[PDB]
Write an enzyme that holds these catalytic residues in place. Structure first.
Site, PDB file in Angstrom:
ATOM      1  N   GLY A 226      69.541  26.925 -21.691  1.00 15.35           N
ATOM      2  CA  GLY A 226      70.520  27.870 -21.187  1.00 15.35           C
ATOM      3  C   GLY A 226      69.866  29.160 -20.769  1.00 15.35           C
ATOM      4  O   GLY A 226      68.729  29.431 -21.134  1.00 15.35           O
ATOM      5  N   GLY A 228      69.002  33.117 -20.818  1.00 17.42           N
ATOM      6  CA  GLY A 228      68.625  34.018 -21.889  1.00 17.42           C
ATOM      7  C   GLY A 228      67.124  33.978 -22.125  1.00 17.42           C
ATOM      8  O   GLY A 228      66.403  33.116 -21.621  1.00 17.42           O
ATOM      9  N   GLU A 249      71.535  22.969 -16.363  1.00 12.71           N
ATOM     10  CA  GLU A 249      72.275  23.755 -15.370  1.00 12.71           C
ATOM     11  C   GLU A 249      71.289  24.596 -14.570  1.00 12.71           C
ATOM     12  O   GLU A 249      71.167  24.442 -13.350  1.00 12.71           O
ATOM     13  CB  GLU A 249      73.345  24.641 -16.037  1.00 12.71           C
ATOM     14  CG  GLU A 249      74.135  25.600 -15.062  1.00 12.71           C
ATOM     15  CD  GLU A 249      74.817  26.797 -15.789  1.00 12.71           C
ATOM     16  OE1 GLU A 249      75.705  26.439 -16.578  1.00 12.71           O
ATOM     17  OE2 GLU A 249      74.557  28.032 -15.507  1.00 12.71           O
ATOM     18  N   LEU A 324      75.319  35.722 -28.923  1.00  7.85           N
ATOM     19  CA  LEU A 324      75.284  37.081 -29.455  1.00  7.85           C
ATOM     20  C   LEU A 324      75.807  37.167 -30.887  1.00  7.85           C
ATOM     21  O   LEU A 324      75.295  37.957 -31.697  1.00  7.85           O
ATOM     22  CB  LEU A 324      76.128  38.011 -28.576  1.00  7.85           C
ATOM     23  CG  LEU A 324      75.728  38.099 -27.103  1.00  7.85           C
ATOM     24  CD1 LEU A 324      76.748  38.954 -26.339  1.00  7.85           C
ATOM     25  CD2 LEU A 324      74.292  38.664 -26.988  1.00  7.85           C
ATOM     26  N   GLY A 347      78.226  27.655 -18.390  1.00  9.50           N
ATOM     27  CA  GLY A 347      78.139  26.263 -18.732  1.00  9.50           C
ATOM     28  C   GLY A 347      77.825  26.052 -20.188  1.00  9.50           C
ATOM     29  O   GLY A 347      77.468  24.936 -20.564  1.00  9.50           O
TER      30      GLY A 347
HETATM   31  C1  LIG Z   1      73.938  35.034 -25.215  1.00  9.17           C
HETATM   32  C2  LIG Z   1      73.191  35.631 -24.031  1.00  9.17           C
HETATM   33  C3  LIG Z   1      73.937  36.902 -23.542  1.00  9.17           C
HETATM   34  C4  LIG Z   1      71.772  36.024 -24.544  1.00  9.17           C
HETATM   35  O1  LIG Z   1      71.010  36.526 -23.422  1.00  9.17           O
HETATM   36  P1  LIG Z   1      69.753  37.501 -23.766  1.00  9.17           P
HETATM   37  O2  LIG Z   1      69.358  38.335 -22.582  1.00  9.17           O
HETATM   38  O3  LIG Z   1      68.649  36.583 -24.281  1.00  9.17           O
HETATM   39  O4  LIG Z   1      70.253  38.461 -24.947  1.00  9.17           O
HETATM   40  P2  LIG Z   1      69.464  39.086 -26.199  1.00  9.17           P
HETATM   41  O5  LIG Z   1      69.579  38.177 -27.377  1.00  9.17           O
HETATM   42  O6  LIG Z   1      68.065  39.363 -25.808  1.00  9.17           O
HETATM   43  O7  LIG Z   1      70.299  40.394 -26.510  1.00  9.17           O
HETATM   44  C5  LIG Z   1      70.361  41.424 -25.511  1.00  9.17           C
HETATM   45  C6  LIG Z   1      70.451  42.804 -26.153  1.00  9.17           C
HETATM   46  O8  LIG Z   1      71.576  42.911 -26.808  1.00  9.17           O
HETATM   47  C7  LIG Z   1      71.280  43.036 -28.385  1.00  9.17           C
HETATM   48  N1  LIG Z   1      72.197  42.245 -29.101  1.00  9.17           N
HETATM   49  C8  LIG Z   1      72.213  40.874 -29.141  1.00  9.17           C
HETATM   50  N2  LIG Z   1      73.184  40.473 -29.974  1.00  9.17           N
HETATM   51  C9  LIG Z   1      73.783  41.604 -30.453  1.00  9.17           C
HETATM   52  C10 LIG Z   1      74.830  41.762 -31.332  1.00  9.17           C
HETATM   53  N3  LIG Z   1      75.639  40.848 -32.046  1.00  9.17           N
HETATM   54  N4  LIG Z   1      75.245  42.998 -31.676  1.00  9.17           N
HETATM   55  C11 LIG Z   1      74.620  44.090 -31.128  1.00  9.17           C
HETATM   56  N5  LIG Z   1      73.586  43.930 -30.261  1.00  9.17           N
HETATM   57  C12 LIG Z   1      73.173  42.679 -29.924  1.00  9.17           C
HETATM   58  C13 LIG Z   1      69.986  42.669 -28.572  1.00  9.17           C
HETATM   59  O9  LIG Z   1      69.259  43.402 -29.639  1.00  9.17           O
HETATM   60  C14 LIG Z   1      69.313  42.986 -27.222  1.00  9.17           C
HETATM   61  O10 LIG Z   1      68.856  44.234 -27.214  1.00  9.17           O
HETATM   62  P3  LIG Z   1      67.616  44.631 -26.287  1.00  9.17           P
HETATM   63  O11 LIG Z   1      68.150  45.134 -24.984  1.00  9.17           O
HETATM   64  O12 LIG Z   1      66.831  45.681 -26.973  1.00  9.17           O
HETATM   65  O13 LIG Z   1      66.722  43.463 -26.050  1.00  9.17           O
HETATM   66  C15 LIG Z   1      72.951  34.605 -22.878  1.00  9.17           C
HETATM   67  O14 LIG Z   1      72.333  33.446 -23.388  1.00  9.17           O
HETATM   68  C16 LIG Z   1      74.238  34.220 -22.241  1.00  9.17           C
HETATM   69  O15 LIG Z   1      74.673  34.906 -21.384  1.00  9.17           O
HETATM   70  N6  LIG Z   1      74.886  33.058 -22.703  1.00  9.17           N
HETATM   71  C17 LIG Z   1      76.128  32.591 -22.152  1.00  9.17           C
HETATM   72  C18 LIG Z   1      75.926  31.564 -21.032  1.00  9.17           C
HETATM   73  C19 LIG Z   1      75.229  30.284 -21.466  1.00  9.17           C
HETATM   74  O16 LIG Z   1      74.892  30.025 -22.640  1.00  9.17           O
HETATM   75  N7  LIG Z   1      74.955  29.340 -20.441  1.00  9.17           N
HETATM   76  C20 LIG Z   1      74.333  28.069 -20.763  1.00  9.17           C
HETATM   77  C21 LIG Z   1      74.193  27.354 -19.430  1.00  9.17           C
HETATM   78  S1  LIG Z   1      72.835  28.148 -18.596  1.00  9.17           S
END
Ligand SMILES: CC(C)(COP(=O)(O)OP(=O)(O)OC[C@H]1O[C@@H](n2cnc3c(N)ncnc32)[C@H](O)[C@@H]1OP(=O)(O)O)[C@@H](O)C(=O)NCCC(=O)NCCS
Length: 440
Positions: A226, A228, A249, A324, A347
């Site tokens: 996925g 991220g 995807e 998250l 997805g």
């Molecule tokens: C979940 C998702 C947002 C993670 O993406 P990511 O860029 O790796 O996010 P991160 O885990 O690095 O977190 C981003 C920031 O928010 C912070 N953060 C993450 N979870 C947090 C939470 N519960 N509370 C507060 N802050 C949080 C992190 O510390 C990080 O900070 P940074 O800017 O210093 O790095 C991403 O996977 C997504 O959009 N998923 C939904 C879509 C999906 O799963 N598609 C699958 C088909 S492709």
């Protein structure tokens, strides 16, 4: 017959190409590196001159291309963003909106991505579609290149289809990825390098997480990774495997690396045997060049790729998605934080479902147990916000502290096991919260 004549009839300037798009209409375009920069600049210019209004733009995975042109804050009274996947571009616009007197300036469209073609064509309706394409070949075909997703559908359902030819767009084989000249309404040419996805750095939690995932990846596994930081980076731990497949995807540099190493053969898949299947690709220049004319990478539309019933036909699917927040029932929020939409379901739920339905398959939702330099727990009592993956769909959860298989577990078993995947600093709080909620 005379494709070179047809080409010249339809070739025009960006200004002319966008000049008849109606006010009060619906427009869509390709994702990320398929956003057509010349066409979008000319469309933004129409808005700047006050020559178009009430134009909804439905789109996903934003690039700087659109952020600098049609999505400029100053145009949002005339070009209305309807994002299906929030990025930093939209999060910036949102903040600016609230600073600007609490204005709401971005619209978000919830969806399962496998349904996006139907939503765009039938529920919403798209009048004009625009997309960057590779050059026309001697048989009269362009290619959607890094895009397929819903583009290959909406390019045909839309009343007008405008293409931006770019020799830097790889020529990619796939289902409906080829576009015949007769299917295009207007052509512009603009040869510029594709936009690159930034490389994310690893964090220490990925060492343990990657090792837990590696033990869960069976022989002959059929991979999806996925969006991220984590999935793209974690799959590098699979460099010692053999005969893996890809049905994903997003095609990202990590998976392509496994192709280049010879880890991925796709020989154990039931569908698309011998080829890596994706619905759209994001990466850096090296990946885009590698995709050009690749005979074992095959794009297909998202209503195929993300369909749980299709995903399930391959044995030993492994889906690795990020999140998250996880609550003590195993429901996940992967898209919303600090009061605002952060990304989208996309997805994620498609592949959670498909992977569990695969024979020998596993859906993994993986995350570091904490955020904000260890001060915030990503394991929480109850999600305050939208749920991406409901508790009845979640299969495995993985943190740096281990794994749990939620299927068939009672609420008590779920809560107790999820608590032991939280960081030790938070386990007592979570246990007391579980007691108050009567989970335990
Ligand atoms: C979940 C998702 C947002 C993670 O993406 P990511 O860029 O790796 O996010 P991160 O885990 O690095 O977190 C981003 C920031 O928010 C912070 N953060 C993450 N979870 C947090 C939470 N519960 N509370 C507060 N802050 C949080 C992190 O510390 C990080 O900070 P940074 O800017 O210093 O790095 C991403 O996977 C997504 O959009 N998923 C939904 C879509 C999906 O799963 N598609 C699958 C088909 S492709």
């Amino acid at each position: 017959m005379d494709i070179r004549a047809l080409y010249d009839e339809k070739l025009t300037t960006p200004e002319e190409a966008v000049s008849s798009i109606a006010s009060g209409s619906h427009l869509s375009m390709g994702g990320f590196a398929a956003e057509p920069p010349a066409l979008l600049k000319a469309l933004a210019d129409r808005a700047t001159r006050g020559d178009i209004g009430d134009l909804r733009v439905y789109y996903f995975e934003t690039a700087k291309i659109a952020g600098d042109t049609i999505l400029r804050y100053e145009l949002n009274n005339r070009i209305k963003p309807y994002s299906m996947f929030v990025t930093a571009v939209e999060r910036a616009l949102i903040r600016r909106g609230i600073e600007d007197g609490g204005r709401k300036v971005v619209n978000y469209v919830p969806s399962n991505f496998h349904q996006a073609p139907r939503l765009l064509a039938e529920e919403i309706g798209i009048d004009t579609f625009m997309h960057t394409v590779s050059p026309m070949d001697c048989h009269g075909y362009f290619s959607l290149g890094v895009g397929n997703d819903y583009s290959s559908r909406i390019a045909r359902s839309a009343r007008r289809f405008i293409v931006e030819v770019n020799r830097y767009m790889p020529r990619v084989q796939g289902e409906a990825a080829a576009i015949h000249i007769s299917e295009v309404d207007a052509i512009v040419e603009n040869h510029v390098p594709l936009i690159e996805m930034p490389v994310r750095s690893a964090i220490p939690e990925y060492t343990s997480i990657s090792h837990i995932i590696a033990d869960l990846v069976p022989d002959g596994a059929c991979l999806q990774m996925g969006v991220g930081a984590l999935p793209n980076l974690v799959c590098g731990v699979l460099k010692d495997r053999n005969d893996l497949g890809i049905h994903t995807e997003v095609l990202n540099p990590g998976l392509v690396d496994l192709i280049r190493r010879g880890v991925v053969t796709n020989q154990r898949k039931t569908l698309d045997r011998g080829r890596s299947v994706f619905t759209f690709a994001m990466g850096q220049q090296e990946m885009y060049e590698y995709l050009n004319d690749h005979p074992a990478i095959f794009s297909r539309p998202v209503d195929y790729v993300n369909d749980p019933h299709i995903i399930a036909q391959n044995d030993n699917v492994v889906s690795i998605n990020a999140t998250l927040q996880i609550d003590l029932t195993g429901a996940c929020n992967s898209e919303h934080m600090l009061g605002h939409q952060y990304s989208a379901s996309g997805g994620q739920l498609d592949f959670v479902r498909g992977a569990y339905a695969s024979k020998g398959g596993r859906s993994i939702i993986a995350t570091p147990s904490t955020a904000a330099k260890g001060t915030v727990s990503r394991i929480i009592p109850r999600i305050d916000g939208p749920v991406t993956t409901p508790r009845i769909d979640t299969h495995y959860i993985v943190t740096e502290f281990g794994a749990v298989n939620l299927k068939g577990l009672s609420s008590t078993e779920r809560a107790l096991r999820i608590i032991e995947l939280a960081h030790p600093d938070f386990r007592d709080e979570l246990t007391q919260a579980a007691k108050k909620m009567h989970l335990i």
